[PDB]
Ligand binder design. Structure first.
Ligand code: NA
Ligand SMILES: [Zn+2]
Length: 56
């Protein structure tokens, strides 16, 4: 399945899309991406479009 993260950072904007075998793995990956990049924001998830957003 495809999933998307929209990053609405203070000085970094982004869109990333992944291929993930299940919903848990996509969640886990975007968790780890958050820890790895020091992302501190408010999160949403839209199941209809498989879209996470994070807004710093
Ligand atoms: Na930023
Ligand atoms: Zn789904």
């Amino acid at each position: 399945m495809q999933f998307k993260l929209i990053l609405n950072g203070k000085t970094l904007k982004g869109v990333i899309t992944i291929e993930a075998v299940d919903h848990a793995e996509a969640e886990k990956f975007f968790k780890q991406y958050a820890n790895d990049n020091g992302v501190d924001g408010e999160w949403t998830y839209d199941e209809a479009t498989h879209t996470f957003t994070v807004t710093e």
